Design an enzyme around this catalytic site. Structure first.
Site, PDB file in Angstrom:
ATOM      1  N   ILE A  25       0.988  -1.252  -0.008  1.00  2.56           N
ATOM      2  CA  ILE A  25       0.007  -0.231   0.235  1.00  2.56           C
ATOM      3  C   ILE A  25       0.931   1.359  -0.070  1.00  2.56           C
ATOM      4  CG2 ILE A  25      -1.939  -1.143   1.049  1.00  2.56           C
ATOM      5  CD1 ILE A  25      -1.224  -0.231   3.669  1.00  2.56           C
ATOM      6  N   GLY A  26       0.342   2.335  -0.699  1.00  2.45           N
ATOM      7  CA  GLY A  26       0.992   3.675  -0.816  1.00  2.45           C
ATOM      8  C   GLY A  26       2.324   3.589  -1.426  1.00  2.45           C
ATOM      9  N   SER A  27       3.308   4.589  -1.054  1.00  2.00           N
ATOM     10  CA  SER A  27       4.690   4.796  -1.430  1.00  2.00           C
ATOM     11  C   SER A  27       5.682   4.879  -0.334  1.00  2.00           C
ATOM     12  CB  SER A  27       4.563   6.171  -2.373  1.00  2.00           C
ATOM     13  OG  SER A  27       3.888   5.742  -3.642  1.00  2.00           O
ATOM     14  N   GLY A  28       6.782   5.683  -0.513  1.00  7.61           N
ATOM     15  CA  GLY A  28       7.594   5.727   0.624  1.00  7.61           C
ATOM     16  C   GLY A  28       8.497   4.588   0.877  1.00  7.61           C
ATOM     17  N   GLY A  29       7.320   4.751   4.063  1.00  9.79           N
ATOM     18  CA  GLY A  29       7.886   3.543   4.315  1.00  9.79           C
ATOM     19  C   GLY A  29       7.464   2.315   3.579  1.00  9.79           C
ATOM     20  N   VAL A  31       5.098  -0.555   3.866  1.00  8.89           N
ATOM     21  CA  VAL A  31       4.102  -0.862   4.409  1.00  8.89           C
ATOM     22  C   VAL A  31       2.991  -1.790   3.796  1.00  8.89           C
ATOM     23  CG1 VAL A  31       1.772  -0.008   5.481  1.00  8.89           C
ATOM     24  CG2 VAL A  31       3.925   1.180   5.601  1.00  8.89           C
ATOM     25  N   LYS A  46       3.895  -2.325   8.994  1.00  5.06           N
ATOM     26  CA  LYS A  46       5.274  -1.435   8.546  1.00  5.06           C
ATOM     27  C   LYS A  46       6.433  -2.114   8.834  1.00  5.06           C
ATOM     28  CE  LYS A  46       7.154   3.122   8.599  1.00  5.06           C
ATOM     29  NZ  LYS A  46       6.565   4.379   8.906  1.00  5.06           N
ATOM     30  N   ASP A 142       6.596  18.490  12.390  1.00  4.17           N
ATOM     31  CA  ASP A 142       6.742  18.293  11.249  1.00  4.17           C
ATOM     32  C   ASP A 142       5.452  17.328  10.575  1.00  4.17           C
ATOM     33  OD1 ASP A 142       8.136  18.071   8.814  1.00  4.17           O
ATOM     34  OD2 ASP A 142       9.153  16.190   9.414  1.00  4.17           O
TER      35      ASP A 142
HETATM   36  C1  LIG Z   1      -9.724  -2.812  -2.042  1.00  2.00           C
HETATM   37  N1  LIG Z   1      -9.920  -1.245  -1.713  1.00  2.00           N
HETATM   38  C2  LIG Z   1     -11.360  -0.911  -2.008  1.00  2.00           C
HETATM   39  C3  LIG Z   1      -9.516  -1.248  -0.401  1.00  2.00           C
HETATM   40  C4  LIG Z   1      -8.359  -0.043  -0.347  1.00  2.00           C
HETATM   41  C5  LIG Z   1      -7.705   0.010   1.258  1.00  2.00           C
HETATM   42  C6  LIG Z   1      -6.490   1.128   1.219  1.00  2.00           C
HETATM   43  O1  LIG Z   1      -5.973   1.213  -0.006  1.00  2.00           O
HETATM   44  N2  LIG Z   1      -6.240   1.386   2.468  1.00  2.00           N
HETATM   45  C7  LIG Z   1      -4.953   2.094   2.837  1.00  2.00           C
HETATM   46  C8  LIG Z   1      -4.461   3.234   1.511  1.00  2.00           C
HETATM   47  C9  LIG Z   1      -3.321   4.083   2.056  1.00  2.00           C
HETATM   48  C10 LIG Z   1      -2.651   4.807   1.137  1.00  2.00           C
HETATM   49  O2  LIG Z   1      -1.758   5.437   1.622  1.00  2.00           O
HETATM   50  O3  LIG Z   1      -3.196   4.863  -0.181  1.00  2.00           O
HETATM   51  C11 LIG Z   1      -2.794   3.963   3.220  1.00  2.00           C
HETATM   52  C12 LIG Z   1      -3.276   2.820   4.374  1.00  2.00           C
HETATM   53  C13 LIG Z   1      -2.933   2.876   5.685  1.00  2.00           C
HETATM   54  N3  LIG Z   1      -3.630   2.276   6.538  1.00  2.00           N
HETATM   55  N4  LIG Z   1      -2.986   2.213   7.924  1.00  2.00           N
HETATM   56  C14 LIG Z   1      -1.668   2.465   7.484  1.00  2.00           C
HETATM   57  C15 LIG Z   1      -0.638   2.759   8.446  1.00  2.00           C
HETATM   58  C16 LIG Z   1       0.560   3.172   7.746  1.00  2.00           C
HETATM   59  N5  LIG Z   1       1.815   3.213   8.479  1.00  2.00           N
HETATM   60  C17 LIG Z   1       2.132   2.153   9.714  1.00  2.00           C
HETATM   61  C18 LIG Z   1       1.593   0.903   9.518  1.00  2.00           C
HETATM   62  C19 LIG Z   1       1.728   0.225  10.622  1.00  2.00           C
HETATM   63  C20 LIG Z   1       2.527   0.607  11.765  1.00  2.00           C
HETATM   64  C21 LIG Z   1       2.747   1.839  11.995  1.00  2.00           C
HETATM   65  C22 LIG Z   1       2.733   2.662  10.714  1.00  2.00           C
HETATM   66 CL1  LIG Z   1       3.413   4.277  10.727  1.00  2.00          CL
HETATM   67  C23 LIG Z   1       0.656   3.624   6.503  1.00  2.00           C
HETATM   68  C24 LIG Z   1      -0.323   3.391   5.779  1.00  2.00           C
HETATM   69  C25 LIG Z   1      -1.488   3.068   5.951  1.00  2.00           C
HETATM   70  C26 LIG Z   1      -4.325   2.164   3.884  1.00  2.00           C
END
Ligand SMILES: CN(C)CCCC(=O)Nc1cc(C(=O)O)cc(-c2n[nH]c3cc(Nc4ccccc4Cl)ccc23)c1
Length: 331
Positions: A25-28, A29, A31, A46, A142
């Site tokens: 999911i996403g970009s960047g 850390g 995850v 993560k 930040d």
């Molecule tokens: C099928 N489709 C409809 C469903 C769509 C569902 C979907 O895409 N969901 C979704 C999208 C995006 C995004 O950025 O685009 C980001 C997340 C997201 N949820 N929780 C996070 C925690 C962290 N960091 C993290 C994680 C764990 C521990 C600590 C940390 Cl800091 C990083 C990213 C996320 C979820």
């Protein structure tokens, strides 16, 4: 074995067997989205690779791990689980952090045409989260959209604990010293960006960023200038001067929906709040508590959210940081 390994994106995730169907999911850390079979819900995982690899990464990983344990608020990250697949300190390599799976990050949300219902509730929650941090003595400095995540019902969580630099306050940019309303600035930058659909102060470095600030807001007063250390003061006092633009011109009417009286009034309210958050001198910039009392925001005000209870900093070698981090992970 309690663990299995799978290739997600370019990285290898070695995770508890309870976490299944990993998807990037996403970009960047680094995850992943996963299904947690024990909780019967979707989580985000993560991977911190070798968080002890240098003293900067290490200090951040350690600090954040420790604070995630501290804090307790629905608009701040709360960890469901933390683990390493490595069995000893000498073998220790990676840390996995698990939290709720949301629906999007705030950068995606900013790209939407948002109504005032959604924008005001998003800003409300940011301010509740920020207030909670400050109540535990954490001043972020930040705050930025990429570290904020949102669900479909518009619920929001801030994911990091602070100290892309576009959202940083004048006092951070100029090395001034700060109080709690340093974080208003950044909230103000996010809000403006929700309206403009462009980053407000997109500098490639601090000089460029300061330039974009003054070009739009105007050169700050002498009162502000003399709170700066003499050499930074020299720099700032000798920049090309600017009268600055008024907020109606910074955020024209064209940017706002004009289809009802509700929206006309909400536009004027939004611009008022913006004009009180995007203030260069922190002595005249609105506080978190005052912002929560602003008419654009106060419609959401719930004391259980706003007034929730909150439960040193040396340097170490990477060897020392590894042990410190390993300890926190293992308890
Ligand atoms: C099928 N489709 C409809 C469903 C769509 C569902 C979907 O895409 N969901 C979704 C999208 C995006 C995004 O950025 O685009 C980001 C997340 C997201 N949820 N929780 C996070 C925690 C962290 N960091 C993290 C994680 C764990 C521990 C600590 C940390 Cl800091 C990083 C990213 C996320 C979820």
């Amino acid at each position: 074995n309690q663990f299995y390994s799978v290739e997600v994106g370019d990285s290898t995730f070695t995770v508890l067997k309870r976490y299944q169907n990993l998807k990037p999911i996403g970009s960047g850390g680094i995850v992943c989205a996963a299904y947690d079979a024990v909780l019967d819900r979707n989580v985000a995982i993560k991977k911190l690779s070798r968080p002890f690899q240098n003293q900067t990464h290490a200090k951040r990983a350690y600090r954040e791990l420790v604070l995630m344990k501290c804090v307790n608020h629905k608009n701040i990250i709360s960890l469901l689980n933390v683990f390493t697949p490595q069995k000893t300190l000498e073998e220790f390599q990676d840390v996995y952090l698990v939290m709720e799976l949301m629906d999007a990050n705030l950068c995606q949300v900013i790209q939407m045409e948002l109504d005032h219902e959604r924008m005001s509730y998003l800003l409300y929650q940011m301010l509740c989260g920020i207030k909670h941090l400050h109540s535990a003595g954490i001043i972020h400095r930040d705050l930025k959209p990429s570290n904020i995540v949102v669900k479909s019902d518009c619920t929001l969580k801030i994911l990091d604990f602070g100290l892309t630099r576009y959202y940083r306050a004048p006092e951070v940019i100029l090395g001034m010293g700060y109080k709690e309303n340093v974080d208003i600035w950044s909230v103000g930058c996010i809000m403006g960006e929700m309206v403009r659909h462009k980053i407000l102060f997109p500098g490639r470095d601090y000089i460029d960023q300061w330039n974009k600030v003054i070009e739009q807001l105007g050169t700050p007063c002498p009162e502000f200038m003399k709170k700066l250390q003499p050499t930074v003061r020299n720099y700032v006092e000798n920049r090309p001067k600017y009268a600055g633009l008024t907020f109606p011109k910074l955020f024209p009417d064209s940017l706002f929906p004009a289809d009802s009286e509700h929206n006309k009034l909400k536009a004027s309210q939004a611009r008022d709040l913006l004009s009180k958050m995007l203030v260069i001198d922190p002595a005249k910039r609105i506080s978190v508590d005052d912002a929560l009392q602003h008419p654009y925001i106060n419609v959401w005000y719930d004391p259980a959210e706003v007034e929730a209870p909150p439960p040193d900093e040396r340097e170490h070698t990477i060897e020392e940081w590894k042990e410190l981090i390993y300890k926190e992970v293992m308890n």
